[PDB]
Amino acid sequence: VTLPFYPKSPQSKDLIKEAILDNDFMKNLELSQIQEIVDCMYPVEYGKDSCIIKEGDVGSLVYVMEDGKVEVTKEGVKLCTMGPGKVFGELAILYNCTRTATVKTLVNVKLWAIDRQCFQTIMMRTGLIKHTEYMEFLKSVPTFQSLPEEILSKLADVLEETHYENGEYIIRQGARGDTFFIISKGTVNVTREDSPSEDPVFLRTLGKGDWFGEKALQGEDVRTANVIAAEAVTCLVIDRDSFKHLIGGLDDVSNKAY
C-alpha cells in the first residue's frame, strides 16, 4: 500500500506530468494518479547505442525521457524518433502484452522509470475505488450498515481520513467540537474530569468500528470528555453539518447513553 518515493526538482516533476498529459493513452488519468506516478519514478540512464526496449520482451518499466533521443523500430521498420518529454514503454503495461516495438538510444539518455507493479497499484487508486472502500468500511460498522445506500454514499462522499499518534488528544474536554469520529484503525481511551483541579478518570476504551464526538454536536457545543489515541489511530471524520444532515436522525447515535 506504500509506494516508493524519489525526490525531484519542480522542473522534472513538471516535465513528467506534461509528458503524461501529452500521451494519448494516459492523458486521461486522474490528477492524483499522475501525481503519484510523478513521485514514484526513479531515474535511469543509458549510453549511446543502447537498447532500452526489445520488441517481444516482457514489459516491466514505463519511461519518460528527460534528456536525449531514441529511435523506435518495429520489424526493422523505422517508426519515429522521440525526444525529451515523451512517454514510451506504456503499451506493454497498459495492455498487458509484450513490447510492441524496439527503442534504442541515439545518444546518452536520461529517463524516469516506473515499474509495472507500482503503475498497476496507482491505476487502482481512483476516486471511485476510494469511495467504494469507504462504503465497504461503513457497511462493516453495525450502526451504519443498516443505513440506506444513498446515505452511505453521501457519507462516503464527505468522509475524511485523519491519523493520530499514540498519546495524541483527538478530543479535549471543555472545548467546542465540530467533528464526529469513526475509528478505522487502532484504539482510543476515553477519560473525563468531573470537577476542576482534578485528574481525569478513565471511562472506556473504544476501537475499530466504534465512534465518538456526537455529544457536542447534539446539545451544547462543548466536549464532555477526553478522547486520546492509545496507539497509532486512524479515524474517518465527519464535519458538524454533514453529521446533522446525514447522521443526526439515527436513534443509535441520537439516543446514545453511557
Q: Binding site residues, as ranges?
A: 89-92, 99-100, 204, 213-216, 223-224, 258
C-alpha distances out from residue 186 to 140, 172, 229, Å: 15, 19, 8
The annotation places the binding site for 3',5'-cyclic GMP at 89-92, 99-100, 204, 213-216, 223-224, 258
- Binding stretches for a second copy (CB under 8 A): 24-25, 74-75, 77-80, 95-97, 120, 123-124, 128-129, 135-136, 139-140, 145, 149
C-alpha distances out from residue 246 to 29, 140, 250, Å: 32, 18, 9
Q: Whole-number minimum distance, CB 101 to a second copy, in Å?
A: 8
Which residues does residue 48 pair with via DSSP β-bridges, in sequence order?
none
C-alpha distances out from residue 2 to 5, 44, 243, Å: 9, 22, 31
- SS3 label, residue 232: coil
User: Which residues inside 184-213 make contact with ligand PCG, applying CB under 6 A?
Assistant: 190, 203-204, 212-213
186 binds, among a second copy, ligand PCG, none (CB under 5 to 8 A by kind): none
Smallest Cα–Cα separation from 178: which of 248, 241, 246, 250?
241
Determine if 228 is a binding residue for ligand PCG (CB under 6 A). Answer: no
- SS3 label, residue 192: strand
Q: How many residues bind ligand PCG (CB under 6 A)?
A: 33
- How many whole angstroms from its chain centre is CA 33? 9
CA angle 175, 177, 183 (to 5 degrees): 115
Q: Whole-number minimum distance, CB 144 to ligand PCG, in Å?
A: 14
Site string for ligand PCG, 56-95 (x = CB under 6 A): ---x------------x-x----xx-------xxxxx---
For residue 49, give the C-alpha cell.
547505442
Binding site for ligand PCG (CB under 6 A): 53, 59, 72, 74, 79-80, 88-92, 99-101, 103, 132, 135-136, 171, 177, 190, 203-204, 212-216, 223-225, 227, 258
